[PDB]
Design a protein around this ligand. Structure first.
Ligand SMILES: C[C@H](CCC(=O)NCCC[N+](C)(C)CCCS(=O)(=O)[O-])[C@H]1CC[C@H]2[C@@H]3[C@H](O)C[C@@H]4C[C@H](O)CC[C@]4(C)[C@H]3C[C@H](O)[C@]12C
Lengths: 51, 56
């Protein structure tokens, strides 16, 4: 099971079928690009933010 | 900027890029995205993926 599946159930309550699918695909693409850009610098900065 | 820590903002940005407008309202969509199960699953996915890329 996954976050993508839970998000899709939410999207099916608020978007047309076609739009829900487009939004999920766009979300997965944005997410994976964001992970790709991640550097050691960014991870270090993250740790300083919370704890 | 960076990976979006708030799922509600991630979905908002995605929808805007996709040109999708909600059947309901952005406020109703965001309320549902804040459900504890949904936010927690997102947090766990994020933690797993960051650790894995760190594994190089
Ligand atoms: C992954 C790092 C922790 C690093 C760590 O502790 N482990 C790395 C080990 C590296 N090594 C020692 C193996 C290198 C070996 C080289 S050696 O010198 O040993 O030769 C931690 C530090 C801060 C953490 C984030 C923040 O909290 C905010 C947020 C909280 C949510 O809840 C979950 C998501 C998120 C984004 C967290 C994700 C992740 O959890 C982070 C990035």
């Amino acid at each position: 099971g996954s976050v993508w599946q839970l998000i899709s159930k939410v999207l099916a309550r608020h978007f047309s079928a076609a739009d829900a699918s487009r939004v999920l695909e766009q979300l997965q693409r944005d997410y994976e690009r964001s992970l790709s850009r991640l550097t050691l610098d960014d991870i270090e900065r993250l740790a300083s933010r919370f704890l | 900027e960076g990976p979006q820590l708030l799922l509600s903002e991630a979905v908002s940005r995605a929808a805007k890029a996709a040109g999708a407008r909600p059947l309901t309202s952005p406020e109703s969509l965001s309320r549902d995205l804040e459900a504890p199960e949904v936010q927690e699953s997102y947090r766990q996915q994020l933690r797993s993926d960051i650790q894995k890329r760190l594994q190089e």
